[PDB]
Amino acid sequence: NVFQTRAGCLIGAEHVNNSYECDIPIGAGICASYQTSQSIIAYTMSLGVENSVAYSNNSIAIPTNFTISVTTEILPV
Amino acid sequence: ANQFNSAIGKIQDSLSSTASALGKLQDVVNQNAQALNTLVKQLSSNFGAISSVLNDILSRLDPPEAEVQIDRLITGRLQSLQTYVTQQLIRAAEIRASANLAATKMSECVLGQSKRVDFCGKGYHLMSFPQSAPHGVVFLHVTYVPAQEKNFTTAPAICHDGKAHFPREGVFVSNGTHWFVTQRNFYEPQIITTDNTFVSGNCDVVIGIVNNTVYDPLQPELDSFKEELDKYFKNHTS
Amino acid sequence: SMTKTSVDCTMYICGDSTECSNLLLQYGSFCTQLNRALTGIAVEQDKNTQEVFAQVKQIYKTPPIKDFGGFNFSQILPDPSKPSKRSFIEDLLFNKVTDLICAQKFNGLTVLPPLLTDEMIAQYTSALLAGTITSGWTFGAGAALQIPFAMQMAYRFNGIGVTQNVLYENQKLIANQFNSAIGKIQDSLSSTASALGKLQDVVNQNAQALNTLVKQLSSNFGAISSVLNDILSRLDPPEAEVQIDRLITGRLQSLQTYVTQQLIRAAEIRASANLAATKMSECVLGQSKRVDFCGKGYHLMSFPQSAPHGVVFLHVTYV
Amino acid sequence: SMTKTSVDCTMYICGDSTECSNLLLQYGSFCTQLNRALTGIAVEQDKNT
C-alpha cells in the first residue's frame, strides 16, 4: 500500500472514496481511521450528514416539544 | 422532573466511562510536571565541560584552571533556568486569560441569567451549577433545547375591517382551516383577539395579507347582555 | 490562523558535520524544549479554526428557488459554476491578501499544511449564511426551524425597541438601503486595500521572522568563518572545537529568540481567536444587545466571510 | 497603557566607541529585532488610548 497525497508519501493506509466523521488529524483535508480483517484507511474529511431545509414564504415551524439537557464545561483556574 | 433528574444521572456515567473530558485539567499538571522534570535533567549534562560534578572538577584541576570549567557549567545552567522562567511567564498568561473567563462564566451563568449565545452553552440558558475540581472548576449548565417540530402555514397580517392587525407577541399560524395565535418557542393555539393584536396601517400596504375575522372579547359580553335584554321586551309589553 | 512552522535543531545549527553531532548532544534536551514548543503552536492553530469557522456540525444549503423579500444576497452566496466554492465578496478578500516558501524550506524551515483547507472554510461559511437567511437564530439553540424572512426582520426590530409595524411600510425602502450598502463593500475593498492590512501584518510578521532567522547563518558570531567545512579543512580537530563552539552557542540563542517570539505572538492570535469565536456566536447566530460589540448602532444580523488566515464579519446595524 | 520606552542597541553596549560596534555586527540582526519589539510596544500603547 504505497500511496501519495498532498501531505506526502503515505504508506500503510488505504484510500476510500466515502466521507465519514474522522478523528486522527493529518492535514491538507485528510484523515486516518482504523476500520474494516481491519486496517487503517485515509479519506477526505466529511462535513457530516446533509440536511436540506425547506424554504417558503408561508411556511413556518414552531416546536411542539422540548427536552431539558445538562452539559458540562471545564476550564483551568 | 423526569428530564432534569435523568440529565444529572448521565453525568456520573460520562465521567466514569470517559476520562478524557477532564483532560483539560490534566494538561495543566502535565505541562508543569514535564517542565520541572526537563529542568532537572539539565544538571546531568556537561554543557561542553569535562564533567557535571562540581567536586570532580575542584578535586582535579587547579583553582585558576577550574574557573574555566566551572564557568562553562554556570553559563549553561543560567540559560536553562532562564528558559523555564520565561516558559512559566508565557504559560501563566494563558492561565490568567482562562481565569478571567471562568470569572465571567461564574457571574453570568451561575449567579444571574445571561442571554448570550454559546456563552453558557448551546441552547437557551437557564441556570448553571459550579463544581469543585483540582486546579480548576467544572460548570454544569442547564439549557432549554426544543425537540419536536411541525410545519405550519403563517401570514404576515390579518385583514378584517380594512385595517391591518399585527401580532403583539408570537406569530399567526394555521392548521389548514382556522388561523391560530401561538408563540415561536412553544405551540399554544389561541384565538385571535383584540388584546393580542393592535391596529396599524391598512390592508393595501402589507404584502401577503389574508382576509379573516377578528374575535373581540367585548362583543359577546354586550351580545349576552343584549340577549339578557331580549327577555325584557316580551315582559313589559305583556 | 497563523502560519505553522516546525524547526529541526540538528541540521539548522550545524549541517553535514559528524563531529558537531557529538558536541550538540552535550546540551541534552535543549532540542526537546524547542521542538515541543513549536509543535504545540502547530496544534493550537488547528484548534482555533474549529471554534470559529464551524459552530455546528450540521451543514445547511440554499434551496433552488430564491425569494429574499426584495434583498439581494447573491453577493455573499457562493457560485456553484466556479471550480472553487467562493462568494462574490470573497473574490476581493482572497486576492487583496497575499517563491518565498520553497526558498526557506531548503535551510530546515518546514511549513506544515493546515488541517483545514481553504475549500472547506467556504463550506462552513455557506452553511451559516444559508441557515441565517432561512432559519434565523433557531438553528443555534437547537434544530433548524424554517421561518419566513419577513418575520425574521420583525423580531430583530423588536429586540432593539422598534415595533414590527415599521418594517411593513418600509419593505420597499429598506430593500433599496440594504442592497446599496452591500454594493459599497465591493468598491471599498477594491479602491482601499488598507482595510485588510490587519491580515497582512500576520503574514508580514511571519515572513520577516523567518527571513530574520535565516540571515543569522551568514554571521560569524565572533568566529573565523560561518562555513563549517572551511574550519574543519583548515584548523586542527582540537583547535576547530573552539571555533565550532562559537558558531553553535551563537545559533542557540538566535533559534531560542525566534521560538520565544512565536510563543508571544501566538498568545495575541489566541486572544483574537477567542474574540472571533464570541463575535461569530452572538452577532451571526443570535442577536446581541451589547454596545460596540457587533459594531456601532443597533445590531440586527452579521454575515461571516472567508479570508486568508482570518475571517471577515459583515454586520448589519440600525442607524 | 504604559510608559513608552526606546532603547538604542549600539549605545547600550558602549557609546562613542567602534570596538563595541565591530563585535555587535558579527551577531547579526539582534539590534533590528530588539528595536522593532520596543517600537511595536510604543505603537500599541497609543492604540489602547
Short mmCIF file of N, CA, C and O in Angstrom, two decimals, chain B residues 24 34-35 38-39 41-42 45-49 79-80 83-84 86-87 90 93-94 101 115-119 122-124 144-152 154-157 166-168 170-171 184-185 198 200-202 205-207, chain C residues 25-30 32-33 36-37 44 47 55-56 137-148 150-152 154-155 158 163-165 168-169 171 252-253 256 260 263-264 267 270 277-278 281-282 285-290 293:
data_model
loop_
_atom_site.label_atom_id
_atom_site.label_comp_id
_atom_site.label_asym_id
_atom_site.label_seq_id
_atom_site.Cartn_x
_atom_site.Cartn_y
_atom_site.Cartn_z
N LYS B 24 -8.51 18.52 30.07
CA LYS B 24 -8.11 19.92 30.07
C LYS B 24 -7.34 20.27 31.34
O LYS B 24 -6.36 21.02 31.29
N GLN B 34 6.29 18.06 33.30
CA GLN B 34 7.32 17.89 32.29
C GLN B 34 8.32 19.04 32.31
O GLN B 34 9.50 18.85 32.01
N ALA B 35 7.86 20.24 32.67
CA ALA B 35 8.76 21.39 32.73
C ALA B 35 9.73 21.27 33.90
O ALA B 35 10.90 21.65 33.78
N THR B 38 12.20 18.30 33.00
CA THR B 38 13.18 18.70 32.00
C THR B 38 14.21 19.66 32.59
O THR B 38 15.39 19.60 32.25
N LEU B 39 13.77 20.53 33.50
CA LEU B 39 14.69 21.47 34.14
C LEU B 39 15.71 20.75 35.01
O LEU B 39 16.84 21.24 35.15
N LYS B 41 16.90 17.60 34.41
CA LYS B 41 17.80 16.85 33.54
C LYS B 41 18.93 17.70 32.99
O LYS B 41 19.90 17.13 32.47
N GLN B 42 18.85 19.03 33.07
CA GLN B 42 19.94 19.88 32.62
C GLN B 42 21.15 19.79 33.53
O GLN B 42 22.27 20.08 33.09
N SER B 45 23.85 17.21 32.29
CA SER B 45 24.60 17.49 31.08
C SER B 45 25.88 18.25 31.42
O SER B 45 25.92 19.06 32.35
N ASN B 46 26.94 17.99 30.64
CA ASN B 46 28.22 18.63 30.88
C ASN B 46 28.27 20.06 30.36
O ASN B 46 29.08 20.86 30.83
N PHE B 47 27.41 20.40 29.39
CA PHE B 47 27.37 21.73 28.79
C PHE B 47 28.73 22.12 28.21
O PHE B 47 29.17 23.27 28.32
N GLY B 48 29.40 21.15 27.59
CA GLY B 48 30.69 21.40 26.99
C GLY B 48 31.87 21.36 27.94
O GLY B 48 33.00 21.64 27.52
N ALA B 49 31.64 21.03 29.21
CA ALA B 49 32.71 20.96 30.19
C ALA B 49 33.23 19.53 30.31
O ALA B 49 32.82 18.62 29.58
N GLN B 79 21.12 29.80 31.22
CA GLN B 79 20.15 29.84 30.13
C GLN B 79 19.04 28.81 30.33
O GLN B 79 17.89 29.06 29.94
N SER B 80 19.37 27.66 30.93
CA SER B 80 18.34 26.65 31.16
C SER B 80 17.34 27.11 32.20
O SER B 80 16.13 26.88 32.06
N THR B 83 15.21 29.86 30.64
CA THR B 83 14.21 29.35 29.71
C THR B 83 12.96 28.88 30.44
O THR B 83 11.84 29.09 29.97
N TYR B 84 13.14 28.25 31.61
CA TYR B 84 11.98 27.79 32.38
C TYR B 84 11.17 28.96 32.90
O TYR B 84 9.93 28.95 32.83
N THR B 86 10.99 31.98 31.67
CA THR B 86 10.30 32.56 30.53
C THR B 86 9.11 31.71 30.09
O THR B 86 8.07 32.24 29.70
N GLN B 87 9.25 30.38 30.17
CA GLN B 87 8.15 29.50 29.79
C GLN B 87 7.00 29.59 30.78
O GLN B 87 5.83 29.49 30.40
N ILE B 90 4.93 32.81 30.14
CA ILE B 90 4.06 32.69 28.98
C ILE B 90 2.87 31.79 29.29
O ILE B 90 1.73 32.08 28.91
N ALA B 93 0.21 33.46 31.45
CA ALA B 93 -0.67 34.38 30.74
C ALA B 93 -1.88 33.66 30.18
O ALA B 93 -2.98 34.22 30.13
N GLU B 94 -1.71 32.41 29.74
CA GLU B 94 -2.84 31.63 29.26
C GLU B 94 -3.76 31.22 30.41
O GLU B 94 -4.98 31.18 30.25
N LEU B 101 -11.91 34.40 32.19
CA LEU B 101 -13.05 33.81 31.51
C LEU B 101 -13.92 33.00 32.48
O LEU B 101 -15.15 33.06 32.42
N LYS B 115 -28.23 36.12 28.37
CA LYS B 115 -28.86 35.89 27.08
C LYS B 115 -27.85 35.64 25.97
O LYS B 115 -28.25 35.48 24.81
N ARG B 116 -26.56 35.60 26.29
CA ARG B 116 -25.53 35.44 25.28
C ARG B 116 -25.55 34.04 24.70
O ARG B 116 -25.81 33.06 25.40
N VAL B 117 -25.26 33.94 23.40
CA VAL B 117 -25.28 32.66 22.70
C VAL B 117 -23.89 32.05 22.73
O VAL B 117 -22.88 32.74 22.57
N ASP B 118 -23.84 30.73 22.96
CA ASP B 118 -22.60 29.96 23.05
C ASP B 118 -21.70 30.47 24.18
O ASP B 118 -20.48 30.29 24.15
N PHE B 119 -22.29 31.11 25.18
CA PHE B 119 -21.57 31.55 26.37
C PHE B 119 -21.77 30.57 27.52
O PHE B 119 -20.81 29.97 28.01
N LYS B 122 -24.75 25.62 24.58
CA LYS B 122 -25.70 25.60 23.47
C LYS B 122 -27.14 25.54 23.99
O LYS B 122 -27.44 24.88 24.98
N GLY B 123 -28.03 26.24 23.28
CA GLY B 123 -29.42 26.29 23.66
C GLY B 123 -29.75 27.51 24.51
O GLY B 123 -28.89 28.31 24.88
N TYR B 124 -31.03 27.64 24.83
CA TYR B 124 -31.50 28.72 25.67
C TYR B 124 -31.12 28.43 27.12
O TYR B 124 -31.51 27.39 27.67
N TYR B 144 -32.27 25.00 27.58
CA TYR B 144 -33.59 24.70 27.02
C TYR B 144 -33.41 24.34 25.55
O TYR B 144 -33.10 25.20 24.73
N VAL B 145 -33.61 23.07 25.23
CA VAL B 145 -33.42 22.55 23.88
C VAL B 145 -34.76 22.05 23.36
O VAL B 145 -35.34 21.12 23.93
N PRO B 146 -35.30 22.62 22.28
CA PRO B 146 -36.53 22.08 21.69
C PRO B 146 -36.27 20.72 21.05
O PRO B 146 -35.14 20.36 20.71
N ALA B 147 -37.36 19.96 20.87
CA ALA B 147 -37.26 18.59 20.37
C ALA B 147 -38.07 18.40 19.09
O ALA B 147 -37.47 18.29 18.01
N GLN B 148 -39.39 18.36 19.16
CA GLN B 148 -40.22 18.04 18.01
C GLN B 148 -40.65 19.30 17.28
O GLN B 148 -40.95 20.33 17.90
N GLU B 149 -40.70 19.22 15.95
CA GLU B 149 -41.08 20.34 15.10
C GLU B 149 -42.21 19.91 14.17
O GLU B 149 -42.39 18.73 13.88
N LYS B 150 -42.96 20.90 13.69
CA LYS B 150 -44.05 20.66 12.76
C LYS B 150 -44.19 21.87 11.84
O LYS B 150 -44.01 23.01 12.28
N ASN B 151 -44.52 21.61 10.58
CA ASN B 151 -44.62 22.67 9.59
C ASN B 151 -46.00 23.33 9.65
O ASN B 151 -47.02 22.64 9.63
N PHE B 152 -46.02 24.65 9.71
CA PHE B 152 -47.25 25.43 9.80
C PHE B 152 -47.32 26.43 8.66
O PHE B 152 -46.33 26.74 8.00
N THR B 154 -48.35 30.30 7.85
CA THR B 154 -48.48 31.58 8.53
C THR B 154 -48.94 32.66 7.56
O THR B 154 -49.09 32.43 6.35
N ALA B 155 -49.15 33.86 8.10
CA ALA B 155 -49.50 35.04 7.32
C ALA B 155 -48.88 36.25 8.00
O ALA B 155 -48.79 36.28 9.24
N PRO B 156 -48.45 37.25 7.24
CA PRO B 156 -47.87 38.44 7.88
C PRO B 156 -48.88 39.30 8.61
O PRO B 156 -48.52 39.95 9.60
N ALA B 157 -50.14 39.32 8.17
CA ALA B 157 -51.15 40.16 8.80
C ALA B 157 -52.53 39.61 8.48
O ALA B 157 -52.70 38.81 7.56
N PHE B 166 -51.49 43.30 13.58
CA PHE B 166 -50.18 42.71 13.73
C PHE B 166 -50.06 42.01 15.08
O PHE B 166 -50.63 42.47 16.08
N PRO B 167 -49.34 40.88 15.14
CA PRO B 167 -49.19 40.17 16.42
C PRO B 167 -48.38 41.00 17.42
O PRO B 167 -47.33 41.54 17.09
N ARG B 168 -48.90 41.09 18.65
CA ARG B 168 -48.14 41.73 19.71
C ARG B 168 -47.06 40.80 20.25
O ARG B 168 -45.91 41.22 20.44
N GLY B 170 -45.70 36.69 19.57
CA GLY B 170 -45.83 35.49 18.77
C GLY B 170 -46.14 35.80 17.31
O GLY B 170 -45.99 36.92 16.83
N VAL B 171 -46.57 34.75 16.61
CA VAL B 171 -46.93 34.85 15.20
C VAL B 171 -48.24 34.11 14.97
O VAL B 171 -48.71 33.34 15.82
N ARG B 184 -43.41 31.51 19.23
CA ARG B 184 -42.43 30.84 18.37
C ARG B 184 -41.71 29.72 19.11
O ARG B 184 -41.32 28.72 18.49
N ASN B 185 -41.52 29.86 20.42
CA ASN B 185 -40.78 28.85 21.18
C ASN B 185 -41.67 27.73 21.70
O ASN B 185 -41.14 26.70 22.15
N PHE B 198 -52.86 44.70 17.49
CA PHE B 198 -53.04 46.14 17.50
C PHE B 198 -53.31 46.62 16.08
O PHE B 198 -52.87 46.00 15.11
N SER B 200 -52.82 48.93 13.03
CA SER B 200 -51.84 49.81 12.41
C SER B 200 -51.92 49.66 10.90
O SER B 200 -52.13 48.56 10.39
N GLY B 201 -51.75 50.78 10.19
CA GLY B 201 -51.77 50.77 8.74
C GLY B 201 -53.12 50.35 8.18
O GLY B 201 -54.17 50.52 8.81
N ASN B 202 -53.08 49.80 6.97
CA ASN B 202 -54.28 49.32 6.30
C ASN B 202 -53.94 48.01 5.59
O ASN B 202 -52.84 47.46 5.75
N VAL B 205 -51.14 47.87 2.14
CA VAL B 205 -49.70 48.07 2.26
C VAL B 205 -48.99 46.73 2.45
O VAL B 205 -48.14 46.36 1.64
N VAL B 206 -49.33 46.00 3.51
CA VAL B 206 -48.68 44.73 3.80
C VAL B 206 -48.95 43.75 2.66
O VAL B 206 -50.10 43.51 2.27
N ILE B 207 -47.88 43.17 2.13
CA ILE B 207 -47.97 42.18 1.06
C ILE B 207 -48.17 40.80 1.68
O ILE B 207 -47.60 40.49 2.74
N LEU C 25 25.06 16.97 21.28
CA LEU C 25 24.47 16.03 22.22
C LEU C 25 24.74 16.40 23.67
O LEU C 25 23.96 16.02 24.55
N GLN C 26 25.82 17.15 23.93
CA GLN C 26 26.15 17.56 25.29
C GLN C 26 25.14 18.54 25.88
O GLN C 26 25.17 18.77 27.09
N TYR C 27 24.26 19.11 25.06
CA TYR C 27 23.25 20.05 25.54
C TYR C 27 21.98 19.35 26.01
O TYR C 27 21.06 20.03 26.50
N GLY C 28 21.89 18.03 25.87
CA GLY C 28 20.76 17.31 26.44
C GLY C 28 19.47 17.59 25.70
O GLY C 28 19.37 17.43 24.48
N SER C 29 18.46 18.01 26.46
CA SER C 29 17.09 18.12 25.99
C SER C 29 16.77 19.47 25.36
O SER C 29 15.60 19.75 25.08
N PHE C 30 17.78 20.33 25.17
CA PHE C 30 17.54 21.66 24.61
C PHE C 30 16.74 21.62 23.32
O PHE C 30 15.94 22.52 23.06
N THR C 32 14.48 19.27 22.68
CA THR C 32 13.13 18.84 23.04
C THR C 32 12.28 20.02 23.50
O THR C 32 11.07 20.07 23.22
N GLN C 33 12.89 20.99 24.19
CA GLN C 33 12.14 22.16 24.64
C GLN C 33 11.66 22.99 23.46
O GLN C 33 10.52 23.49 23.46
N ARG C 36 8.98 20.78 21.12
CA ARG C 36 7.64 20.68 21.69
C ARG C 36 6.95 22.04 21.75
O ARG C 36 5.71 22.10 21.76
N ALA C 37 7.72 23.12 21.79
CA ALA C 37 7.13 24.45 21.81
C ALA C 37 6.51 24.80 20.46
O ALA C 37 5.38 25.31 20.39
N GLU C 44 -2.25 24.20 18.16
CA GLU C 44 -3.14 25.26 18.63
C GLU C 44 -3.77 26.02 17.47
O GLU C 44 -4.91 26.49 17.59
N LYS C 47 -6.75 24.22 16.29
CA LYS C 47 -7.84 24.28 17.25
C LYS C 47 -8.63 25.58 17.12
O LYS C 47 -9.83 25.60 17.39
N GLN C 55 -19.40 26.51 13.75
CA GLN C 55 -20.03 26.49 15.07
C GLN C 55 -20.77 25.18 15.31
O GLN C 55 -20.71 24.62 16.41
N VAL C 56 -21.48 24.68 14.30
CA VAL C 56 -22.28 23.47 14.42
C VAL C 56 -21.77 22.44 13.41
O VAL C 56 -21.12 22.77 12.42
N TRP C 137 -32.19 32.60 13.89
CA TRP C 137 -31.48 32.28 15.11
C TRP C 137 -31.88 30.93 15.70
O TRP C 137 -31.39 30.56 16.77
N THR C 138 -32.76 30.18 15.03
CA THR C 138 -33.30 28.96 15.60
C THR C 138 -32.31 27.80 15.61
O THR C 138 -32.28 27.04 16.58
N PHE C 139 -31.49 27.65 14.57
CA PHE C 139 -30.59 26.50 14.49
C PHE C 139 -29.41 26.61 15.44
O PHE C 139 -28.69 25.62 15.63
N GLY C 140 -29.18 27.78 16.04
CA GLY C 140 -28.10 27.91 17.00
C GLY C 140 -28.43 27.34 18.36
O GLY C 140 -27.55 26.77 19.02
N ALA C 141 -29.68 27.47 18.80
CA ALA C 141 -30.13 26.95 20.08
C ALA C 141 -30.78 25.58 19.96
O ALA C 141 -31.25 25.04 20.98
N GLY C 142 -30.83 24.99 18.77
CA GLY C 142 -31.50 23.72 18.59
C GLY C 142 -31.61 23.37 17.12
O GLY C 142 -30.82 23.83 16.30
N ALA C 143 -32.60 22.54 16.81
CA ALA C 143 -32.82 22.11 15.44
C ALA C 143 -33.24 23.29 14.56
O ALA C 143 -33.76 24.30 15.04
N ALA C 144 -33.00 23.14 13.26
CA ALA C 144 -33.32 24.21 12.32
C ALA C 144 -34.83 24.35 12.15
O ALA C 144 -35.53 23.37 11.90
N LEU C 145 -35.32 25.58 12.30
CA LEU C 145 -36.74 25.89 12.17
C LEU C 145 -36.89 26.93 11.06
O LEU C 145 -36.42 28.06 11.20
N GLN C 146 -37.54 26.54 9.96
CA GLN C 146 -37.72 27.47 8.86
C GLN C 146 -38.73 28.55 9.24
O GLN C 146 -39.79 28.25 9.81
N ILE C 147 -38.39 29.80 8.94
CA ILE C 147 -39.23 30.94 9.27
C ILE C 147 -39.25 31.88 8.07
O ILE C 147 -38.22 32.04 7.41
N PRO C 148 -40.39 32.50 7.74
CA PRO C 148 -40.40 33.49 6.66
C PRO C 148 -39.45 34.64 6.97
O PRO C 148 -39.32 35.07 8.12
N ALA C 150 -39.70 37.70 6.24
CA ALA C 150 -40.40 38.89 6.72
C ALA C 150 -40.61 38.85 8.23
O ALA C 150 -40.63 39.89 8.89
N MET C 151 -40.79 37.65 8.79
CA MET C 151 -40.95 37.52 10.23
C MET C 151 -39.62 37.61 10.97
O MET C 151 -39.59 38.01 12.14
N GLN C 152 -38.51 37.26 10.31
CA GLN C 152 -37.21 37.34 10.96
C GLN C 152 -36.79 38.79 11.17
O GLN C 152 -36.18 39.12 12.19
N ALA C 154 -38.82 41.11 11.76
CA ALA C 154 -39.71 41.68 12.76
C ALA C 154 -39.17 41.52 14.17
O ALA C 154 -39.28 42.43 14.99
N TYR C 155 -38.57 40.36 14.48
CA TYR C 155 -38.05 40.13 15.82
C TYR C 155 -36.77 40.91 16.05
O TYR C 155 -36.51 41.39 17.17
N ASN C 158 -37.72 44.11 17.13
CA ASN C 158 -38.32 44.09 18.46
C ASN C 158 -37.24 44.16 19.54
O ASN C 158 -37.41 44.86 20.55
N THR C 163 -41.19 48.62 17.12
CA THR C 163 -42.34 47.78 16.82
C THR C 163 -42.25 47.25 15.39
O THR C 163 -41.83 47.96 14.47
N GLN C 164 -42.64 45.99 15.21
CA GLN C 164 -42.53 45.33 13.92
C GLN C 164 -43.37 45.99 12.83
O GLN C 164 -43.18 45.67 11.65
N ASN C 165 -44.29 46.88 13.19
CA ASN C 165 -45.12 47.54 12.18
C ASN C 165 -44.29 48.43 11.27
O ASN C 165 -44.67 48.65 10.11
N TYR C 168 -43.19 46.96 7.68
CA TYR C 168 -44.10 46.67 6.58
C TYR C 168 -44.14 47.80 5.56
O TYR C 168 -44.00 47.58 4.35
N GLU C 169 -44.34 49.04 6.03
CA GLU C 169 -44.32 50.17 5.11
C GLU C 169 -42.93 50.45 4.56
O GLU C 169 -42.81 51.07 3.50
N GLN C 171 -40.71 48.07 3.70
CA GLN C 171 -40.19 46.94 2.93
C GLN C 171 -39.56 47.39 1.62
O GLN C 171 -38.51 46.88 1.21
N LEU C 252 22.31 28.99 19.00
CA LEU C 252 21.36 28.53 20.01
C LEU C 252 20.48 29.68 20.49
O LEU C 252 19.26 29.50 20.65
N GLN C 253 21.07 30.85 20.72
CA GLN C 253 20.28 31.99 21.19
C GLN C 253 19.41 32.56 20.08
O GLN C 253 18.30 33.04 20.35
N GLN C 256 16.51 30.24 19.89
CA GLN C 256 15.70 30.41 21.09
C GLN C 256 14.92 31.72 21.06
O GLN C 256 13.81 31.79 21.59
N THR C 260 10.81 31.94 21.29
CA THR C 260 10.22 32.82 22.29
C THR C 260 9.33 33.88 21.64
O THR C 260 8.28 34.24 22.19
N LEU C 263 5.98 32.23 20.68
CA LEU C 263 5.10 31.99 21.81
C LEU C 263 4.38 33.26 22.24
O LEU C 263 3.22 33.22 22.66
N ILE C 264 5.05 34.41 22.13
CA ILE C 264 4.41 35.68 22.48
C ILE C 264 3.40 36.08 21.42
O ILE C 264 2.30 36.55 21.73
N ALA C 267 0.13 34.08 21.54
CA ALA C 267 -0.80 34.49 22.59
C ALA C 267 -1.73 35.59 22.10
O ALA C 267 -2.90 35.64 22.49
N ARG C 270 -4.18 33.81 19.74
CA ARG C 270 -5.14 33.04 20.52
C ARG C 270 -6.17 33.95 21.19
O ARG C 270 -7.35 33.60 21.29
N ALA C 277 -14.42 33.98 18.03
CA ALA C 277 -15.39 32.94 18.36
C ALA C 277 -16.61 33.52 19.07
O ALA C 277 -17.72 33.00 18.91
N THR C 278 -16.42 34.58 19.86
CA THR C 278 -17.55 35.21 20.53
C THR C 278 -18.34 36.09 19.56
O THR C 278 -19.58 36.13 19.62
N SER C 281 -20.60 33.85 17.40
CA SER C 281 -21.76 33.25 18.04
C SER C 281 -22.86 34.28 18.28
O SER C 281 -24.03 34.04 17.96
N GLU C 282 -22.50 35.43 18.85
CA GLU C 282 -23.53 36.39 19.27
C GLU C 282 -24.03 37.23 18.10
O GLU C 282 -25.23 37.49 18.00
N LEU C 285 -25.06 34.07 14.73
CA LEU C 285 -26.08 33.08 15.08
C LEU C 285 -27.27 33.74 15.76
O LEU C 285 -28.42 33.60 15.31
N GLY C 286 -27.03 34.47 16.85
CA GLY C 286 -28.07 35.13 17.59
C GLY C 286 -28.08 36.63 17.38
O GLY C 286 -27.61 37.15 16.36
N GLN C 287 -28.64 37.34 18.36
CA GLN C 287 -28.72 38.79 18.35
C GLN C 287 -28.23 39.31 19.70
O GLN C 287 -28.82 38.99 20.74
N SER C 288 -27.17 40.11 19.68
CA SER C 288 -26.56 40.63 20.90
C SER C 288 -26.95 42.09 21.10
O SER C 288 -26.96 42.88 20.15
N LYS C 289 -27.27 42.44 22.34
CA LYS C 289 -27.61 43.81 22.71
C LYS C 289 -26.40 44.61 23.16
O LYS C 289 -26.55 45.77 23.56
N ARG C 290 -25.20 44.03 23.11
CA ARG C 290 -24.01 44.70 23.59
C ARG C 290 -23.62 45.85 22.67
O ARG C 290 -23.74 45.75 21.44
N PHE C 293 -20.05 45.97 20.21
CA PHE C 293 -19.63 44.58 20.07
C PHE C 293 -19.79 44.11 18.63
O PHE C 293 -18.81 43.74 17.97
#
